[PDB]
Each structure stands twice: as structure tokens, then as C-alpha cells.
Design an enzyme around this catalytic site. Structure first.
Site, short mmCIF file in Angstrom:
data_model
loop_
_atom_site.label_atom_id
_atom_site.label_comp_id
_atom_site.label_asym_id
_atom_site.label_seq_id
_atom_site.Cartn_x
_atom_site.Cartn_y
_atom_site.Cartn_z
N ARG A 90 4.99 -19.94 -5.42
CA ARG A 90 6.43 -20.13 -5.67
C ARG A 90 7.24 -18.81 -5.57
O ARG A 90 8.45 -18.87 -5.33
CB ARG A 90 6.68 -20.82 -7.03
CG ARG A 90 6.30 -19.98 -8.24
CD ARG A 90 6.55 -20.62 -9.59
NE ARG A 90 5.96 -19.77 -10.62
CZ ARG A 90 4.70 -19.83 -11.06
NH1 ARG A 90 3.87 -20.77 -10.62
NH2 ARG A 90 4.27 -18.96 -11.97
N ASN A 91 6.59 -17.63 -5.77
CA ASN A 91 7.23 -16.32 -5.68
C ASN A 91 6.76 -15.50 -4.46
O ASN A 91 6.64 -14.28 -4.53
CB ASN A 91 7.03 -15.55 -6.98
CG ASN A 91 7.63 -16.26 -8.16
OD1 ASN A 91 8.74 -16.81 -8.08
ND2 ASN A 91 6.94 -16.28 -9.28
N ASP A 100 10.71 -12.14 -6.96
CA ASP A 100 10.84 -12.41 -8.39
C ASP A 100 10.20 -11.34 -9.24
O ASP A 100 8.99 -11.34 -9.43
CB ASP A 100 10.26 -13.80 -8.73
CG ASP A 100 10.87 -14.45 -9.96
OD1 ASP A 100 11.09 -13.74 -10.97
OD2 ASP A 100 11.14 -15.67 -9.91
N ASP A 115 3.97 -12.23 -12.38
CA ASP A 115 4.35 -13.58 -11.98
C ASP A 115 3.97 -13.90 -10.53
O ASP A 115 4.69 -14.66 -9.87
CB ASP A 115 5.86 -13.77 -12.19
CG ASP A 115 6.30 -15.20 -12.44
OD1 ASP A 115 5.44 -16.11 -12.40
OD2 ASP A 115 7.52 -15.41 -12.63
C1 LIG Z 1 14.28 -11.45 -6.46
O1 LIG Z 1 14.66 -11.56 -5.10
C2 LIG Z 1 15.79 -12.30 -4.89
C3 LIG Z 1 17.04 -11.70 -4.95
CL1 LIG Z 1 17.18 -10.00 -5.28
C4 LIG Z 1 18.19 -12.40 -4.69
C5 LIG Z 1 18.09 -13.75 -4.36
C6 LIG Z 1 16.87 -14.40 -4.31
C7 LIG Z 1 15.69 -13.68 -4.57
N1 LIG Z 1 14.41 -14.26 -4.42
C8 LIG Z 1 14.10 -15.63 -4.39
C9 LIG Z 1 14.36 -16.59 -3.35
C10 LIG Z 1 14.91 -16.44 -2.01
C11 LIG Z 1 15.02 -15.16 -1.44
C12 LIG Z 1 15.38 -15.00 -0.10
N2 LIG Z 1 15.69 -16.03 0.71
C13 LIG Z 1 15.63 -17.27 0.18
C14 LIG Z 1 15.23 -17.53 -1.16
O2 LIG Z 1 15.14 -18.85 -1.58
C15 LIG Z 1 14.20 -19.61 -0.82
C16 LIG Z 1 13.89 -20.90 -1.61
C17 LIG Z 1 15.16 -21.65 -2.03
C18 LIG Z 1 14.77 -22.27 -3.38
C19 LIG Z 1 13.46 -21.57 -3.75
O3 LIG Z 1 13.24 -20.54 -2.80
N3 LIG Z 1 13.79 -17.80 -3.76
C20 LIG Z 1 13.20 -17.64 -4.98
C21 LIG Z 1 13.36 -16.31 -5.38
C22 LIG Z 1 12.86 -15.88 -6.67
O4 LIG Z 1 13.07 -14.77 -7.17
N4 LIG Z 1 12.04 -16.78 -7.35
C23 LIG Z 1 11.57 -18.05 -6.79
C24 LIG Z 1 12.58 -18.68 -5.81
#
Ligand SMILES: COc1c(Cl)cccc1Nc1c(-c2ccncc2OC[C@@H]2CCCO2)[nH]c2c1C(=O)NCC2
Length: 300
Positions: free
Chosen positions: A136-137, A150, A132
């Protein structure tokens, strides 16, 4: 693989960040028990088996880890199973390239390509097929530091296995390699195809790949020898990297080790490889600066 269980009572100021195909992501502060250290964290939830498989993959690849791969701090058991990671304050790189387009220089774009290729090379060494990879990831810790996130569709390959044969679950066609669309086969070289689409998204400052084209036509478009267009800022050497990533023969595509080298060579003279108007007069906050504290999926 060890999963920490971070108590529910330890988190504070939990507020929504965004929602989409990934589920829901929030931001909060994790105050670990017996110590005073308010840690900014991101919390994700959605199917509770699917989020636990994501946690297993992330924990399996935690030691030694990589600066450009998101690390799972632990999980929390509230009404649903939640994932916890260090908050990336600048958000998603896809939204970052769209909002800060008029201040992103060639040095940043080529360094982000290096950093994504570094994290992907680390995942390849741990026999992990991400499946993936897309803008976006990819998250922004600081404007100069990005991390791959992700692991919902990511799969660890067995010791003898060289490829993963997927079920009829939803997958991102416009980022996938042709063999993944026709035969549902996923390898590290199919990830190289997705890496090239991610680079194309960065170079176009967040344009949608194959915009207005239905996903059911992509296999046909790719078999006709057609590909994503040359972004206006790309010199021919940068576009030939993307086009080598989208070759029909999976083995002929560049390796993540070679992409680290080629993009690092480009980052040493970034204005030779990307023509950006007003590039010498573009700035983004850095932890070195004194003012840093101020700052798709379809059924196959
Ligand atoms: C998989 O790792 C994660 C875990 Cl373990 C916990 C929380 C978030 C994530 N990662 C992600 C964040 C994220 C992780 C860290 N800090 C901010 C975050 O969000 C940022 C913006 C907010 C809305 C979309 O992303 N945002 C996204 C993921 C994801 O897995 N898929 C796409 C959107």
C-alpha cells in the site's frame, strides 16, 4: 532540510484519487511561478503536526535521494497543511498487482523487489527507520519503476541510537516484526520483516496477510514458529528469502544490501525463480515503447 512552499494559486485540475488510513490523496498540475511547465503532482492531507513531521523526514533524506524513494517537492498551506510530490500515474503497487495480475511477469516481480530493497538500503544509510513498509506504501511511476512512499510513521535515529522506542499510537501489526509487537522496538531489521511481508503481497498478487486472523493473535502465531504461506508462484529460493526476513533474531534477518544482490541474481534468470503460467507472453507499457503516452493499523 529545506521545505519549499508552493503557492495555492499555482495548482490546477485538483481531483480526488483515493482515501484511507493515509488520509486523502489528490492529483493536479503544479504550474510553477515565472515559468510554463505543467507538472503532474499528487497532493496529500489528513493532526497538522503529524503531516509536518512526515515532510521533515522526507526533506531530511532528499539529498542525494534515490530513484525508488518518493521525493517531497514541497508543501502548500490551504485550509490544512498539504504535501506535494511528483504524481506516480499508475497509482499504488498494491492496487496495481491486483488489477494487472494476468499480465505481471516474473521479471517485474523480482525487479520490484530489487527496487524496494534499493530504496530501503538508501533509507538505512540515512539512519531512517520507515516503520510502515507495505505494498500500500509502494507506488508505480511506470510498470518497470516503483518508489517507497508514506513517511508518517518514519523516524530518524540519533547518531548514538540503534533503535526507536514507540508510544501507544496505532501501528500495522500484520506487517510488523515480533519485537515491535511485544516491546515496541523499531530498527532497520524490523523494516526487513516488513519488506518480506511486502514481497509476500507482491508474490500473491495482492493477498491480505493473515486473512481473517485477528491482529491480537499475531504475536502468538509468530512465537509458535508459524509464518505466511508459500505463494504458488514462488520457488523455494524466493520463499526462503521471505522466511529469513521473518526470523526471531533481528540480526539474523537479511540486510537490504544482501536483498538487492539476491533479488538481482534472481532477476537475471527470472523464470528459474518464479513459475508463472504464460510468462513469456505477458506485457506491460514501458517508456521505451512508442505507445507509452497512451498509458490494518491497531492500538498496541
Ligand atoms: C508521502 O508522499 C506523498 C506526498 Cl509528499 C504527497 C502526496 C502523496 C504522497 N504519497 C502517496 C500517494 C501517491 C503519490 C504519488 N502519486 C499518486 C499517489 O496516489 C496513488 C494512489 C491513489 C490512492 C492511493 O494511492 N498515494 C499514497 C501515498 C501515501 O503516502 N500513502 C499511501 C497512498
Amino acid at each position: 532540510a529545506l521545505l519549499r512552499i508552493l503557492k495555492e494559486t499555482e495548482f490546477k485540475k485538483i481531483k480526488v484519487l483515493g482515501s484511507g488510513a493515509f488520509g486523502t490523496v489528490y492529483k493536479g498540475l503544479w504550474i510553477p511561478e515565472g515559468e510554463k511547465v505543467k507538472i503532474p503532482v499528487a497532493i496529500k492531507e489528513l493532526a497538522n503536526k503529524e503531516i509536518l513531521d512526515e515532510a521533515y523526514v522526507m526533506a531530511s533524506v532528499d539529498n542525494p535521494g534515490n530513484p525508488h524513494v518518493c521525493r517531497l517537492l514541497g508543501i502548500c498551506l490551504t485550509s490544512t497543511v498539504q504535501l506535494i510530490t511528483q504524481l506516480m500515474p499508475f497509482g499504488c503497487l498494491l492496487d496495481y498487482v491486483r488489477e494487472h495480475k494476468d499480465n505481471i511477469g516474473s521479471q517485474y516481480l523480482l525487479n520490484w523487489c530489487v527496487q524496494i530493497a534499493k530504496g530501503m538500503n538508501y533509507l538505512e544509510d540515512r539512519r531512517l527507520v520507515h516503520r510502515d513498509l507495505a505494498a500500500r506504501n509502494v507506488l508505480v511511476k511506470t510498470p518497470q519503476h516503483v518508489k517507497i512512499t508514506d513517511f508518517g510513521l518514519a523516524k530518524l535515529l540519533g547518531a548514538e541510537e540503534k533503535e526507536y522506542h514507540a508510544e501507544g499510537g496505532k501501528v500495522p501489526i500484520k506487517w510488523m516484526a515480533l519485537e515491535s509487537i511485544l516491546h515496541r522496538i523499531y530498527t532497520h531489521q524490523s523494516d526487513v520483516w516488513s519488506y518480506g511481508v511486502t514481497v509476500w503481497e507482491l508474490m500473491t498478487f495482492g493477498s491480505k496477510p493473515y486473512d481473517g486472523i485477528p491482529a491480537s493473535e499475531i504475536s502468538s502465531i509468530l512465537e509458535k514458529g508459524e509464518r505466511l504461506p508459500q505463494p504458488p508462484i514462488c520457488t523455494i529460493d524466493v520463499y526462503m528469502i521471505m522466511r529469513k526476513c521473518w526470523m526471531i533474531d533481528a540480526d539474523s534477518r537479511p540486510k537490504f544490501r544482501e536483498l538487492i544482490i539476491e533479488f538481482s541474481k534472481m532477476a537475471r534468470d527470472p523464470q528459474r525463480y518464479l513459475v508463472i503460467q504464460g510468462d513469456e507472453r505477458m506485457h506491460l507499457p514501458s517508456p521505451t515503447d512508442s505507445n507509452f503516452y497512451r498509458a490494518e493499523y491497531l492500538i498496541p
